[PDB]
Design a protein around this ligand. Structure first.
Ligand SMILES: O=C(CCc1ccc(O)c2c1[C@H](C(=O)O[C@H](Cc1ccc(O)c(O)c1)C(=O)O)[C@@H](c1ccc(O)c(O)c1)O2)O[C@H](Cc1ccc(O)c(O)c1)C(=O)O
Lengths: 167, 168
């Protein structure tokens, strides 16, 4: 992996399912000027991952007030993401999303971020906080069974923005 | 940058630590096989973000004990510097008495093994690692220098890994 604290976060260009439900090719560099929370989850149509994704989506406004873009990603195809979004939450899907979901079918983004579980071809639960300069500020990687906290992620984003202010 | 990989044995180390009783002891990560371990790096002694974290982990050590989890802190400073900070009154910015050991990594090889050395400065980033009772690395956390870690979040992770170890 090439993700190093204090260095530019590895860029990517990938197809995402955008909040409007439609495909768009996006790049991490598209969000320079904003903080970014970039998180991986292992795969679509699973048990723990939708709880995390929906939590980040539901609370997207709290990141927007921090000028912070949230982006999720898995090695699934962009069609698989679309299927999951188009499946209602009450039927085990994601439902409508407030955040883009990146597809990493070549596994190169997960590799660049050091979160590929090589023996399965899927990502660990990696989460990365990138500042408005594109510099990586925080690395979080959970083994597959344990999910992430939106509260903790907001705490971190808020703290980096506060400490960015001292000069 | 490091040999710390999720699902692999956490890199072993043997290093001098200042123990809670205020004495120096050479300890190894492998000493704690059979228990979960929270192993965290902080950049330097006699600083001003690090003490909030260290004191919080020490103050709340009993919550980790109830999870059968050992907490270990570490920085590149000498163990003598660690003890000097422990022995500095809290009212003057010291750590005060500690409930957790503080490892000294003067060769920077432990930080390098865990992939958290800030190479242009010779100090560790704020790396935190959750290691299960079999020695396997389960969680990686690395913060840039200015931003501290949360004991609440660390407890949540340790307990959650332990729960999923028993039933998934
Ligand atoms: O002791 C600290 C930082 C203490 C501090 C003091 C006064 C502040 O005013 C302040 C902070 C916090 C901070 O991180 O400042 C640093 C350094 C700095 C301070 C003032 C400046 O003007 C400047 O330019 C640069 C930064 O931002 O780089 C942040 C803060 C954070 C939480 C709060 O609750 C709060 O109130 C304020 O503001 O850290 C070291 C680590 C370490 C090792 C080597 C480095 O070389 C190094 O940089 C850092 C550790 O703890 O081991």
């Amino acid at each position: 992996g090439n993700a190093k604290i204090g260095h530019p976060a590895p860029n990517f260009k990938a197809t995402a399912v955008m909040p409007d439900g439609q495909f768009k090719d996006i790049s991490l560099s598209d969000y320079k000027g904003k903080y970014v929370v970039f998180f991986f989850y292992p795969l679509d149509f699973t048990f723990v991952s939708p709880t995390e994704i929906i939590a980040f989506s539901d609370r997207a406004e709290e990141f927007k007030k921090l000028n912070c873009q949230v982006i999720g990603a898995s090695v699934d195809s962009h069609f698989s993401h679309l299927a999951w979004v188009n499946t209602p939450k009450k039927q085990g899907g994601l439902g409508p999303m407030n955040i883009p979901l990146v597809s990493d079918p070549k596994r190169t983004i997960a590799q660049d971020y050091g979160v590929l579980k090589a023996d399965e071809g899927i990502s660990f639960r990696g989460l990365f906080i990138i500042d408005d300069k594109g510099i990586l500020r925080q690395i979080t990687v959970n083994d597959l069974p344990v999910g992430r906290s939106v509260d903790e992620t907001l705490r971190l984003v808020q703290a980096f923005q506060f400490t960015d202010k001292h000069g």
